[PDB]
Amino acid sequence: RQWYSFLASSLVTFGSGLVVIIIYRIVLWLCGWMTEAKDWAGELISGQTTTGRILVGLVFLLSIASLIIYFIDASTNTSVETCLPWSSSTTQQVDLAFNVFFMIYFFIRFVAANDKLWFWVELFSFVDYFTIPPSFVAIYLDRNWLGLRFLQALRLMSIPDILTYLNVLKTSTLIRLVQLVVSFVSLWLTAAGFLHLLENSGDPFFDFGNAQHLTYWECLYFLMVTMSTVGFGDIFATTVLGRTFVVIFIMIFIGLFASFIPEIAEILGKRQKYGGSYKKERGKRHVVVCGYITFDSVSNFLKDFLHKDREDVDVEIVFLHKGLPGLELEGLLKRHFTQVEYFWGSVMDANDLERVKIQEADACLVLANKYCQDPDQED
Amino acid sequence: NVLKTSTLIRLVQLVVSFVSLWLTAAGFLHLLENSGDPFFDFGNAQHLTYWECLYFLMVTMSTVGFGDIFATTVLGRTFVVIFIMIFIGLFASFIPEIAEILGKRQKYGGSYKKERGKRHVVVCGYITFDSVSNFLKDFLHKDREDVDVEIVFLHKGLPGLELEGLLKRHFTQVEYFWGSVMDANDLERVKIQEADACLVLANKYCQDPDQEDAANIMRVISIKNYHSDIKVIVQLLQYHNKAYLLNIPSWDWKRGDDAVCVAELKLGFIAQSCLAPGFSTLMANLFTMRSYKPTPEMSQWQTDYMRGTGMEMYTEYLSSAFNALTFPEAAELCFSKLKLLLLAIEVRESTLAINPGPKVKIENATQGFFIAESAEEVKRAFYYCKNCHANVSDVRQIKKCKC
Ligand SMILES: [K+]
User: Fold this and answer.
1) What is the DSSP letter of B397?
2) How far is CA A357 from CA A114, A338, A339, A361, A362, in A?
3) Which residues contact A11 (CB under 8 A, 6 or more apart)?
4) Which of A143, A237, A362, B30 is most solvent-facing, going by the fewest CB within 10 Å?
5) Can you tell me whether residue B172 is helix, strand or coil?
6) Judging by DSSP bridges, how do beta strands B367-372 and B341-347 pair with one another?
7) Are B169 and A243 within 8 A, CB to CB?
8) Which residues of A are part of a known binding site?
9) φ and ψ of A287, to 5 deg
């Protein structure tokens, strides 16, 4: 019915701002407090001031809140355009409040930006043009359009920066993890929104006659079923715009999914198994063992050390070495689990010595790699 | 001759060969299904559009395989079998190779933009999260004066993730660029003619410090060749290398150029300890920014020692109230009234003098050298007034005098 008025609000706001920048650039080409404002705004969005850390916390929360409002509106609706007076639609009211906050944040970024022209073409500036002006048209008429609002899922891509500005991503692997997860999820969610718009709206060059009423969730499922190349065909696109989007999506997202899953599996596979600390039993003796620890040296040692013809002395053996134990050693450790323990670490670190409670060990044994390339270096 | 570059040649061969093969294969399948099987007298046929075939071949190249569309002529199905065997290898090699080529572009290209009258310092050589954090922790230290200098890193590598985080945290005043000071275009990119100074950093842990110092000499040669009047400060891992850069035609320590020879300094510091046992620790603490930060588990000697570490050396102009005192009275006055340890002065050419004897008068606008807990402390020596402040026993009250 009237959806093009919502779309036009984003285009006139984009275009008029771009024209104002271009004529100003040309006037200044043909022919202080500005810098103080830029620096202050820069410090603010960087979370360098405490009010900046507050603003960053609000950008983080209100992105998620807006996205949930989009999921609600996308889930509990039929036609993409929908007639409804604004005073009755509670989600459309809190959506306006969030769009006002994001408009203020957009101008704060604009002040902070070093080039205004490139800033007017940065991805989040498009998210803002395609969301805030439509949210005002949604007051000026007794109706709404579930149009480009799905682009709110891209605001999640700010989260790794926020969790850097709030200095909580302290470690390189954890930084890489949160970039991977958030970029993958935000791309998957936004792509599902775009396909949901295309199929429910139908082909414009067939006067919207060719259309298909998917839920957002069916699109979200279907994009996972295609990213993975599983391809059931229980759900499939049938608008020409839908099918052309699926072709583009396949070319892009197979590379994403097929690189993302292994890199997540490597990162979640990296955690050390034999962490933790030894627990001291009541009056029971233990001997710490370190240096060249291997299935060979440990079996040669334990065969004599735990030999059945010794007296029944209740000493526990506590290995301490930097490596992950090899499978033959893991078997040997499980066979002797009652009285033998292993820990990742080195006797060169006072924390690892505390982990094995070496102050309360009966003795410590240091073993040499007899077959090393330089016995002076090994000693 | 427009494909001027090997990667761009490879890109256009990949894209065009893939697209032309995909389009022509879609045409062949479109012919087969719409024509039907000839050995069934064309009775078995299926009216696909070209676009449905084009879509269906992408859905099969990718192995997605919906089965919303599928071939049903025997010639169609046999063509789909051949197409699968051929084009899975094409698609599965094409997509990664495009992703590598489009992934190759340099992030930190472009050029620094000079703000109105704002100072910047170019930094180059061994740039890493370690060396940059060790540097910036002292260089941007909160206990320094609020000086608006911007730091502009210039190095060949892409920055590691920890460094990208550090650069984003300091985004307001720290910048990074891909390049090398060995190239006059990169020196222009960072506008080094208009930089306040340039710092050259050494990899202290390199496999040959003679080779690392040779590389750093080159740099200084390249920087000075591009513009002679840049203040250059260079780190040297060896003393014997210094003599080479002393021979550079526009190297000028009277102009403020300098070499931080860590070997010369190290051995000087520990040699003074042979004259006065703990002096290397006394002196090393004066030359690093360090805040005093007690915690109640510290022993007496630790709380004392750490108060000592809370010092740095600072420089400030003496107020006119010091004029024509001897250095002895100026030191007595600083210590007793201002709670400042004056130890040396700039004497008019002009030269530094340490603890100079009674014969040396203080003169107007003498720079003094002080030990103190902050730059905020030494200010008292600039504001002091021999009428207006002479009995201000609450020393923190000293400010701009009426007298
Ligand atoms: K499949």
Assistant:
1) G
2) 57, 18, 16, 7, 10
3) none
4) A362
5) coil
6) antiparallel
7) no
8) 281, 309, 316, 341
9) -120, 120
CB contact under 8 A, A164 and B58: no
Inter-residue contact B245 to B222 (CB < 8 Å) = no
**Reported resolution in A?**
3.4
Is A162 within 8 Å of A56 (Cβ atoms)?
yes
Q: Among all chains, which residue has been given the structure tokens 């009423």?
A: A213
Give the dihedral of Cα atoms B371, B373, B376, B377; nearest 10 deg. -60
Residue owning tokens 């600390």: A277
Phi, psi angle pair for B281, to nearest 5°: -75, -45
Q: Do B172 and A161 touch (CB under 8 A)?
A: no
Q: How far is B58 from chain A (nearest CA, A)?
A: 7
Q: Which technique was used to obtain these atomic coordinates? A: cryo-EM
Q: Are B174 and B151 in contact (CB under 8 A)?
A: yes
Length of chain B measured in residues: 403
What 3 state SS string does A261-288 have?
A: HHHHHHHHHCCCCCCCCCCCCCCCCEEE
| DSSP assignment of B106-153 | -TT-S-----TT--EEEEEES--HHHHHHHHHHHT-TTS----PEEEE
**Would you call B31 exposed, middle or buried from its count of C-beta atoms within 10 A (0-12, 13-18, 19+)?**
middle
Tokens at A53, concatenated: 């850390």
Q: From the centroid of its chain, how far is CA A160?
A: 7
The helix (H) or strand (E) run that includes residue B200 is strand B197-201
Q: Please state the residue numbers annotated as binding site of A for Mg(2+).
A: 281, 316, 341
User: Are A251 and B95 within 8 A, CB to CB?
Assistant: yes
CA distance B85 to B78: 11
Burial class (CB in 10 A: 0-12, 13-18, 19+), B74: middle
Interface of A with B (CB under 8 A): 32, 35, 39, 42-43, 46, 48, 114, 161, 164-165, 167, 169, 172, 175-176, 226, 229-233, 236, 238, 240, 243-244, 246-247, 250-251, 254-255
**CB-based contact B174:B207 (threshold 8 Å):** no
Look at residues B337, B364, B335 and name the one whose alpha carbon lies nearest to residue B345: B364
Q: Do B67 and A233 touch (CB under 8 A)?
A: yes
Helix/strand/coil (H, E, C) string of A103-169?
HHHHHHHHHHCCCHHHHCCCHHHHHHHCCHHHHHHHHHCCEEECCHHHHHHHHHHHHHHHHHHCCCC
Place of tokens 């997860």: A181
Q: What is the dihedral of CA A112, A118, A119, A123, to 10 degrees?
A: -140
Please report residues of A whose CB lies closer than 8 A to that of B96. Answer: 255
Query: Inter-chain contact A236–B58, Cβ cutoff 8 Å?
Result: no
Q: Which H, E and C letters describe chain A, residue by residue?
A: CCHHHHHHHHHHHHHHHHHHHHHHHHHHHHCCHHHHHHHHHHHHHCCCCHHHHHHHHHHHHHHHHHHHHHHHHHHCCCCCEEECCHHHCHHHHHHHHHHHHHHHHHHHHHHHCCCHHHHCCCHHHHHHHCCHHHHHHHHHCCEEECCHHHHHHHHHHHHHHHHHHCCCCCCHHHHHHHHHHHHHHHHHHHHHHHHHHHHHHCCHHHCCCCCCCCCHHHHHHHHHHHHCCCCCCCCCCCCHHHHHHHHHHHHHHHHHHHHHHHHHHHHHHCCCCCCCCCCCCCCCCEEEEEECCCHHHHHHHHHHHCCCCCCCCCCEEEEEECCCCCHHHHHHHHHCCCCEEEEECCCCCHHHHHHCCHHHCCEEEEECCCCCCCHHHHC
Nearest by Cα to A114 from A22, A37, A197: A37
Please give the distance, rounded to the nearest whole angstrom, from the Cα atom of residue B67 to the centre of ligand 1. 9
Amino acid letter at B373? E
Distance from the alpha carbon of residue A357 to the mean position of ligand 1, in angstroms = 55
Best interface-test mutation with B: which of A248, A254, A257 has the largest number of B CBs within 10 A?
A: A254
